[PDB]
Amino acid sequence: NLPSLFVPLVGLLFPAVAMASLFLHVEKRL
Amino acid sequence: GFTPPELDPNTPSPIFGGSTGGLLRKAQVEEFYVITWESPKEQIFEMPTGGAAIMREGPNLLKLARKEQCLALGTRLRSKYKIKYQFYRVFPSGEVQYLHPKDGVYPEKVNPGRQGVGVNFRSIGKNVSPIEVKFTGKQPYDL
Amino acid sequence: DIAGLTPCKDSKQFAKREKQSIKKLESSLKLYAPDSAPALAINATIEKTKRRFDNYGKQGLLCGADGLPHLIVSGDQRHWGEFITPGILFLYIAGWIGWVGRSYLIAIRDDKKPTQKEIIIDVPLATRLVFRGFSWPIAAYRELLNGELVAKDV
Amino acid sequence: VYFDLEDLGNTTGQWDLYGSDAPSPYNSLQSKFFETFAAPFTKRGLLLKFLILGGGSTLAYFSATASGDILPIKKGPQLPPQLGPRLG
Amino acid sequence: MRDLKTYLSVAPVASTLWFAALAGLLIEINRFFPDALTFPFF
Amino acid sequence: PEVKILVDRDPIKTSFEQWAKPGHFSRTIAKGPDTTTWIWNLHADAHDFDSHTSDLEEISRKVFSAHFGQLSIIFLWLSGMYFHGARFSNYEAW
Amino acid sequence: PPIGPKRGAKVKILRQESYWYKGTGSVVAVDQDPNTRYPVVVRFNKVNYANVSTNNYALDEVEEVK
Amino acid sequence: SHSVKIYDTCIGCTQCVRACPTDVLEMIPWGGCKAKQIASAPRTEDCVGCKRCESACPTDFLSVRVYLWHETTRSMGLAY
Numbered sequence: 001n002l003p004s005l006f007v008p009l010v011g012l013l014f015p016a017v018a019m020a021s022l023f024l025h026v027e028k029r030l
Numbered sequence: 031g032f033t034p035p036e037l038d039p040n041t042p043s044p045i046f047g048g049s050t051g052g053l054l055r056k057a058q059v060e061e062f063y064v065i066t067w068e069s070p071k072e073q074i075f076e077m078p079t080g081g082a083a084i085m086r087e088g089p090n091l092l093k094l095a096r097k098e099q100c101l102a103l104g105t106r107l108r109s110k111y112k113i114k115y116q117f118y119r120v121f122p123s124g125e126v127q128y129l130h131p132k133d134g135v136y137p138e139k140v141n142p143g144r145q146g147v148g149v150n151f152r153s154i155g156k157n158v159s160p161i162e163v164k165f166t167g168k169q170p171y172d173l
Numbered sequence: 174d175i176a177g178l179t180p181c182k183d184s185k186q187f188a189k190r191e192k193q194s195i196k197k198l199e200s201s202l203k204l205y206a207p208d209s210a211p212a213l214a215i216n217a218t219i220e221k222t223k224r225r226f227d228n229y230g231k232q233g234l235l236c237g238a239d240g241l242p243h244l245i246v247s248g249d250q251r252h253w254g255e256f257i258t259p260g261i262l263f264l265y266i267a268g269w270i271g272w273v274g275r276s277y278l279i280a281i282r283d284d285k286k287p288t289q290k291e292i293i294i295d296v297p298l299a300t301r302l303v304f305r306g307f308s309w310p311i312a313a314y315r316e317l318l319n320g321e322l323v324a325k326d327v
Numbered sequence: 328v329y330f331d332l333e334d335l336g337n338t339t340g341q342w343d344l345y346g347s348d349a350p351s352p353y354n355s356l357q358s359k360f361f362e363t364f365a366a367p368f369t370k371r372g373l374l375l376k377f378l379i380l381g382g383g384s385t386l387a388y389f390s391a392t393a394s395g396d397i398l399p400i401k402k403g404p405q406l407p408p409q410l411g412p413r414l415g
Numbered sequence: 416m417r418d419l420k421t422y423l424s425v426a427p428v429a430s431t432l433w434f435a436a437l438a439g440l441l442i443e444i445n446r447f448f449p450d451a452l453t454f455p456f457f
Numbered sequence: 458p459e460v461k462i463l464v465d466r467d468p469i470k471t472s473f474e475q476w477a478k479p480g481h482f483s484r485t486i487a488k489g490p491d492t493t494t495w496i497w498n499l500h501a502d503a504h505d506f507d508s509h510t511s512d513l514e515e516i517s518r519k520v521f522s523a524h525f526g527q528l529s530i531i532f533l534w535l536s537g538m539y540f541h542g543a544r545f546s547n548y549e550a551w
Numbered sequence: 552p553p554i555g556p557k558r559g560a561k562v563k564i565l566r567q568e569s570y571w572y573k574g575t576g577s578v579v580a581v582d583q584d585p586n587t588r589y590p591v592v593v594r595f596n597k598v599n600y601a602n603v604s605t606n607n608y609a610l611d612e613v614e615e616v617k
Numbered sequence: 618s619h620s621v622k623i624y625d626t627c628i629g630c631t632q633c634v635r636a637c638p639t640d641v642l643e644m645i646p647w648g649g650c651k652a653k654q655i656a657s658a659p660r661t662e663d664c665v666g667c668k669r670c671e672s673a674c675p676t677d678f679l680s681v682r683v684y685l686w687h688e689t690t691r692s693m694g695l696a697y
């Protein structure tokens with residue numbers, strides 16, 4: 001049961017959030 | 031004392047059908063370049079970007095995307111034909127910056143109004159070791 | 174014997190290899206008329222095989238469990254023919270070649286265009302110099318002592 | 328003229344080639360429909376949060392409640408476990 | 416004639432002659448003394 | 458505009474003098490080597506005729522004779538194949 | 552008085568970044584005009600990596616060797 | 618922009634300026650060689666870093682040096 005929660009958590013949600021966030025930080029202009 | 035000739039718009043441009051090699055968005059928001067020259071006749075010349083264009087008799091104006099394209103075409107105009115050229119940088123504000131020939135004299139001919147830049151008065155082997163400029167912003171060749 | 178090996182004259186595996194080789198060539202030989210030239214060729218290979226194994230057995234080569242000669246290069250005096258003696262021969266020939274080539278390079282180095290004789294060989298000079306290699310060990314030893322072998326402060 | 332230091336957008340080709348500039352072909356009442364209904368999604372930061380958390384929890388839901396008739400990984404092995412080369 | 420001997424002295428030609436002689440020699444030596452892992456004469 | 462047989466007599470003298478001058482075709486290579494790079498250039502530029510001369514006629518003559526050389530080699534190679542077929546083949550048994 | 556070594560004299564190159572460093576070359580001409588920072592002109596038996604066989608050196612970068 | 622420097626080993630043969638494809642270099646007066654001229658790099662913001670000048674220098678060692686440094690649109694040779 002727990003792998004069905006954490007495998008999509010770190011294999012889909014976490015990479016999407018990290019890639020979007022890093023994209024924003026990397027494209028920012030001060 | 032030298033006065034740069036101002037860029038005259040309404041100066042005609044060479045006869046050319048257009049190419050995919052010309053300007054892009056860079057010219058709109060960043061900068062582009064303009065080379066002018068005087069031709070004795072209508073000639074065919076190779077464009078630094080497309081194929082072949084027809085240089086017009088009299089003043090010619092040609093907008094290019096990079097400085098190196100202006101200097102390449104100008105080198106050829108001075109070589110194959112015997113043509114004087116100038117070129118400028120143009121910003122999207124309309125401001126123009128005269129670039130070449132900077133003195134009215136070509137830079138390979140020594141002109142006395144010229145000030146030294148980046149000249150180090152030593153052999154190249156006398157540059158210090160990196161450790162001696164470490165943690166300082168300097169580079170051993172900046173001295 | 175040495176290294177747990179056995180002399181190839183005493184090795185069953187060695188004789189089994191000679192047997193299987195010869196019977197293999199004879200299996201090829203059964204296909205041709207005995208007067209034919211392929212037949213004589215396979216017979217010559219057979220005689221050459223027997224000569225091979227008999228010579229390896231004679232000259233004292235040790236064999237592994239594989240039935241194949243193994244060479245003893247430790248310097249054991251029973252096996253100098255396996256390395257030390259052909260090795261001295263090699264060093265004589267290689268020293269000859271290098272000493273002669275060095276003699277040529279020294280001979281042409283003060284020419285007006287040295288590279289000219291490096292791409293087009295001065296064959297008369299080369300023929301004059303080839304037989305210096307016969308005495309290269311004395312020549313090089315004498316140069317080492319005299320200080321002509323090594324360039325100064327390099 | 329094609330070169331004018333006054334207007335560089337024209338000089339550098341900064342045009343809208345296929346932009347229509349015509350008025351709305353969408354009739355109203357349809358427009359007000361979508362304007363009132365899609366309005367909560369027009370705040371970009373809020374939409375980002377709603378998509379990451381909404382889609383994330385949605386994913387967690389269909390993953391936690393999946394059936395073996397859909398995924399072989401939930402169904403688990405249905406055969407007697409085989410025997411290793413030398414071992415179990 | 417002098418030019419032809421010169422051409423025959425050039426690096427690749429002298430190399431083919433030299434190594435061709437060396438090859439014939441080594442071939443004939445392996446023809447009269449085939450196989451041989453050792454120097455048997457001691 | 459009247460097509461006809463056109464040649465010139467004795468344009469190049471048959472001699473071994475330039476056999477002995479490596480890189481004779483190039484004004485730079487003919488000076489001989491100062492470094493080993495020379496040796497490679499001599500071989501990379503050997504058939505680059507339009508780099509040796511700008512005269513189209515000379516280039517065309519080199520090209521033509523070179524084609525003769527190629528055909529000579531091809532005929533020697535076919536001579537090899539037929540001769541080996543006659544002398545070192547099982548072609549009759551086959 | 553003449554400055555620098557005699558013309559034709561063999562000198563040892565002391566410039567560390569020179570292709571001919573610790574080698575020797577022959578003096579051609581020593582520019583007697585002062586304010587010239589590298590007056591000694593040396594020719595070499597071997598070309599450097601720029602296919603150049605001559606170079607100018609300072610007085611303290613050549614050491615006359617017989 | 619790339620840094621470009623001249624060293625007083627320069628003999629003023631003008632070949633670095635002739636080679637430069639973006640006009641970075643000039644010949645200025647000087648008293649240290651016979652040609653009475655020395656190179657200079659007053660426009661390194663246009664320097665693309667191709668080192669044609671270095672290929673052109675006859676001095677041993679070089680009297681032009683191009684130290685490739687912070688990249689810009691001009692130094693990357695971008696027409697876009």
Ligand code: CLA
Nearest residue numbers: 001002003004005006007008009010011012014015018400
């Ligand atoms: C750091 C070593 C490490 C490694 C390489 C793994 C590897 C793995 N874990 Mg595990 N895990 C670890 C530590 C580790 N874990 C720790 C310390 C705990 C708490 C006791 C867990 C608890 C855990 C659970 C409950 C599950 C996994 C699962 C898994 C597998 C699927 C990946 C996953 O679901 O995300 C991993 C999930 C986690 C909760 C890991 C985070 C735990 C700590 C805090 C790590 C720190 C993360 C931090 C925020 C980022 C640091 C980057 C990195 C260096 C860790 C995978 C092979 C799943 C599985 O077995 O699938 C079959 C599963 O259900 N892990």
Ligand code: CLA
Nearest residue numbers: 247248249250257261264265268309310311313314315317
């Ligand atoms: C890995 C270390 C090692 C080393 C370095 C050696 C070295 C040597 N071993 Mg030993 N061995 C070793 C391990 C080693 N062994 C082990 C572990 C074992 C146990 C299995 C053995 C068991 C073993 C045995 C049983 C024997 C040796 C012997 C020898 C010597 C044979 C060569 C000789 O006789 O002189 C050299 C022979 C010559 C003819 C010299 C002439 C060659 C000239 C100098 C070279 C030619 C160059 C050119 C022509 C001239 C140069 C010119 C110049 C001035 C420019 C040699 C010095 C044998 C020995 O002691 O010999 C008496 C011997 O009996 N070894």
Ligand code: CLA
Nearest residue numbers: 428431435480481482499500503504519522523526527530
């Ligand atoms: C196989 C195709 C081919 C063809 C047809 C040519 C044709 C030509 N070459 Mg080229 N060449 C080739 C291959 C070829 N080459 C290859 C593979 C290389 C190496 C990259 C070269 C490198 C080369 C160089 C460097 C030069 C030429 C030149 C020439 C021209 C000289 C013509 C001449 O004088 O004839 C020659 C007359 C003959 C009678 C030929 C007989 C020569 C034989 C082989 C003598 C060698 C025998 C030798 C002793 C071996 C026997 C020993 C034994 C043990 C086997 C000519 C048009 C020269 C030129 O002027 O360029 C325009 C020139 O300088 N070639």
Ligand code: CLA
Nearest residue numbers: 497498499500501502503504505506507508520523524527
């Ligand atoms: C009839 C067809 C034909 C013709 C006449 C030419 C003619 C020419 N070519 Mg072209 N070309 C061809 C086909 C042809 N090529 C093909 C099929 C290719 C694809 C590979 C090319 C690609 C090509 C390139 C990239 C270049 C040329 C160049 C040239 C010019 C220089 C030739 C020269 O001097 O090189 C001399 C010949 C040699 C140095 C021989 C090299 C030895 C080869 C690499 C190894 C062969 C391996 C061997 C067959 C197998 C192993 C045997 C070995 C172990 C002994 C010349 C005018 C060069 C040029 O500068 O143009 C002006 C050049 O840069 N060609």
Ligand code: CLA
Nearest residue numbers: 460461462463517520521522523524525526527528529531
């Ligand atoms: C019917 C007349 C005729 C024939 C049969 C040929 C045949 C050939 N020509 Mg040629 N040619 C002709 C007329 C002819 N040509 C004319 C009118 C022109 C324009 C003026 C040219 C100009 C031309 C050029 C520039 C070249 C050729 C080349 C070739 C060869 C191409 C490769 C090939 O196919 O090999 C196949 C091989 C054979 C068929 C073997 C038979 C060849 C025999 C011996 C020659 C027969 C025709 C010959 C011209 C007769 C004249 C001989 C007499 C004057 C003593 C080929 C043999 C290339 C070449 O020269 O290669 C060396 C080439 O470069 N031709």
Ligand SMILES: CC1=C(/C=C/C(C)=C/C=C/C(C)=C\C=C\C=C(C)\C=C\C=C(C)\C=C\C2=C(C)CCCC2(C)C)C(C)(C)CCC1
Nearest residue numbers: 246247248256257267268269270271272273275309313322
């Ligand atoms: C005995 C033996 C052994 C051993 C060995 C050893 C261990 C050795 C050592 C050795 C060494 C350790 C050596 C050394 C070296 C050094 C040096 C320093 C060098 C040199 C050289 C030279 C100098 C050369 C010259 C020349 C000549 C002479 C000829 C040719 C030319 C030339 C120039 C090249 C073994 C067991 C293996 C085997 C058995 C036997």
Ligand code: SF4
Nearest residue numbers: 637664665667668670
């Ligand atoms: S690196 Fe290229 S662009 Fe820069 S100064 Fe040298 S020649 Fe000019």
Ligand code: SF4
Nearest residue numbers: 627628630631633674
């Ligand atoms: S190439 Fe060297 S010597 Fe010549 S002008 Fe440039 S910096 Fe001076």
